Design a protein around this nucleic acid. Sequence first.
RNA 1: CGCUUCAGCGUUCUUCGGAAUGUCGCGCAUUGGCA
Lengths: 310, 135, 132, 128, 210, 210
Amino acid sequence: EKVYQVKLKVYGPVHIGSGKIIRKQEYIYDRRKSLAHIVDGPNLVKFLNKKGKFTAYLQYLNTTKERADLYTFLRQEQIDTNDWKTFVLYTERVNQGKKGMNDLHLFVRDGRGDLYIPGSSLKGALRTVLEGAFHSLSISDSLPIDPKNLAIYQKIDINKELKPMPLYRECVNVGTTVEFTMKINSDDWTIEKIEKQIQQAYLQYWNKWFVGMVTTPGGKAFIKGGGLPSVLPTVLFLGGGTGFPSKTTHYLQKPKEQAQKDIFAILQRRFRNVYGKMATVPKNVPMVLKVNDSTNKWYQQGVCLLEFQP
Amino acid sequence: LAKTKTGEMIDLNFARKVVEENKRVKDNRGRQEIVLFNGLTTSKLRNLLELINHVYTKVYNSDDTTLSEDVRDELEYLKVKFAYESGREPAVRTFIEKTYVDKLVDVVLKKNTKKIFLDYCKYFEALVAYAKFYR
Amino acid sequence: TKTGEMIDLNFARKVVEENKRVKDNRGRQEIVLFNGLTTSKLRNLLELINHVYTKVYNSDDTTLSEDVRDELEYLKVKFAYESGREPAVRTFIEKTYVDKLVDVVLKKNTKKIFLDYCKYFEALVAYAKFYR
Amino acid sequence: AKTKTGEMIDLNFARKVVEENKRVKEIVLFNGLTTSKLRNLLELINHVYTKVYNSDDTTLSEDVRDELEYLKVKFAYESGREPAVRTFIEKTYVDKLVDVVLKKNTKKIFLDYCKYFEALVAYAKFYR
Amino acid sequence: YSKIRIVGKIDVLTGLHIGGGGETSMIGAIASPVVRDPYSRLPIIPGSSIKGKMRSLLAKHIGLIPGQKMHNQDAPEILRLFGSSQKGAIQSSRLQISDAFFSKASQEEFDKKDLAYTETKFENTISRLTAVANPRQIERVTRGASFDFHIIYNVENINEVMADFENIKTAIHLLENDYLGGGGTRGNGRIRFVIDSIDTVVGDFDSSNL
Amino acid sequence: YSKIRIVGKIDVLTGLHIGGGGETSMIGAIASPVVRDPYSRLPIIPGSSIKGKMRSLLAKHIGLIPGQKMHNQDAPEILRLFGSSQKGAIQSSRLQISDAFFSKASQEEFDKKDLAYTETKFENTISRLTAVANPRQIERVTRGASFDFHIIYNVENINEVMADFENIKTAIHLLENDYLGGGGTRGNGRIRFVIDSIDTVVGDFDSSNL
RNA sequence: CGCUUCAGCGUUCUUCGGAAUGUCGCGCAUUGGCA
């Protein structure tokens, strides 16, 4: 059995979810500083109990139920920044598409408390690309990710135009390198075979669907802002929110028109409130492209370039 | 576990009672559109369950029957989260007020026992299961 | 049982066999039980039963302890949950009357009646495995 | 009792049925039945046999009748798990004789069934 | 007749899931728990799990006869080191790998950093056509946990000890690369073996060269 | 004629499985139980198991004659200690090892933690050609449990008492470095002996040195 | 400004051997016999 070292080069922010979402009430958003202080609830509650501010917090939550940002409440009663750091877990960068944030999706962290990309998530992606029992393929969990490489991004849907939405997720910043250890057997899987299949899968993804978003005006703005990297090609959308083409082997295999019709049928079967109301197959299925930054560059969610080293 | 208002017992049977009391057909367009707790969807129920699940597994890994101060603060934040979710959505408010959940977690804090917390988590789990069954 | 039928191991056999359907596809038989109930779901239900049975068997008194009674209440909630998630499981529960039996064992509150129900579940899973 | 084609069930038939199934290859009984599965079934019938043995009343009590019912259930389960156990059970008609013992409801018929089972095990050991 | 005792430490590079049944799971909670020592309620690595992974790895390494149905059909070195039950050729197992309990040093280290012994990981399986995902929660031993093992080697033949310990070290090298417990394809079970001391506790054998 | 009573404790370092048949269980439930005292329903260590393991280890250590076939052919020390039945050379057994019962202190300690004395270990066998798991559930006595043994030594020859107790010490050391019960090669039944009192109950022999 | 679905699924549930063996199977005294 041969072994290799997988180098995941993050060209688009990657968010491996943890199953836990928080709201603007739970954490701190310094808009002027443009930083999101992720806090843990028990410490904040005990701090407010010690300071006697917990009743004020409950009243503030009651007053504006829909919008109850913690930062505005703490500014209301003038709580010191060090008092924040008492209960604040850690701060994160902010890249807001829209103002204040709405819903935050937390990254996956192990018991030791470090960020890491799980092996199973990489294995699933490589299985989606490689299918057509994967016991021979093995992916180790990633080496822990430095917290400096984590930042909050805002997801922008592009249905021929950019649209800010209440999507904010903790993602690995672009330019980050992630290390995995991969072991395969010579008989069943070949490293060259899987790399070639990754390349062909990305080529299909580009030809079948990506051009159908490039032609769009919002896609044109996405490209002009730098959303499409010059380099991107062993591309694999490892993260969550990459899109319907990603997470689905069938679109690449089916003829562009046949695949579009089948995807439209599936989406109408599942999501009747959006695609069910649509009478005909759109030019591109799915309709919207699946992220901006403080810099000039635009990004699409979850883009990665793999690099296997023996 | 505990007792709600008017001395009524809180059990898994009472969880079925609560879920069926707010269960109504309300058929629309000649098609059955099951309504639970006035528009409460499964997603909100599952979010509340997961909020329970965190401190559940935290207590499950513990050996001592007494709830540690970490569990106490987790339950305080659980009350905060339940109040916030009820304020955000009227359906969640209806579910919380009908199910007496915050009273139950206050009783759990009062008892400071692993068994009462388990029973509360089981009652919350029952409510979720019943809701899934009747939907 | 409804219609004056009596719950039994032979009752389990007749329940499994009458719900059994060949459903030949492409000239190949595909036996389906309780509208396509897979054996993995039955094994999960049997695992619940196994845990409650171990708990009660390790006990001494014939009268069930509150810990066993709590597991029986949880078992009914689990049966309700699984009924909702999979229609085949709901069909199995409604045909077997296993959920009704859990209420009956609670009313009996004795170890012998539980053991009988345990044997009924064993008969259900055994005949499902045999007729497959 | 009796089998199909009017043959008689006895220890002589136990020997006869162990012999007809016996196929040379290694000596194969009932298409691959091993001594271990036979001893497991013998363990089941041995538990029931001890239950009845300890008793003195000729009529089979309720508990041993339920034990025989669960014996039938275990027979079905083992038949489902292994083809060879199913073949052995259908060729030796052990479950049918369990039904017959339940019908007769006496210690003598159950002891005769135990003797028949034991003879099946003994001749299986002898012909291997 | 000599008994040699090998004591060391097994450190989990990644989360380890060796499962144990018999536990009912609340909806949305740990469906598959890890095996734990009932006394301390701490995670444990079973001796059988280490022996089976090591013997299996060593058997694949040496080679398998085509159509190898039984474990009793194995290489002679595997049959001698790990035992046998073949009728008429009942050999003896010179390895007595035992349960690796949770180390006290690592337990105190975890208690310092306010870390739970077992992490909970969220997984799901997504249909490659309908794009419908079914989620699950798995329990795994937190990375950096330590387990100390205890392997007894019986000297049935004095002349074969060097070869048997060469095979033992080969199996250790194989198992350290391979995973243990839950699937390593998903990256669960990465482990590291660091030996503390090798010494013949009983008898007059010389284990210093080992 | 003197009778010296050895009394102590057997501490379960790793879960102990001593197989006892005669149990029917539900489909998917416990497959292999442990030997238990019927009156108390608590796990037991038979004196047969202790004596057999000690005698086997001692006979291995002293040596086995080439092509030995029976136990009466063991070394003269072993025959003197554990008994013999050879034709014309029947030697009485000076050691009378008794069944080790579950200690009351250990029972109260387990009741303190609300812990069951027996755990159901979940194991499986992976086939070598199909790689399909076959599941088993083995009952074991929980680690941290103690069994208080009881041994009687009959001083028949005053001269050989020191040598006999040296052999008993060697056998107990071997058993501590070995396992008791079944599955020990895969990490079961590791025990420790804690001797509480060696005294001469019957006669006027001096057991202070022993 | 978040919302919704999904919460585990499919599959093995023990297997293969040993099922007691070896030893003694009444002895003596009286009766008898022989002296």
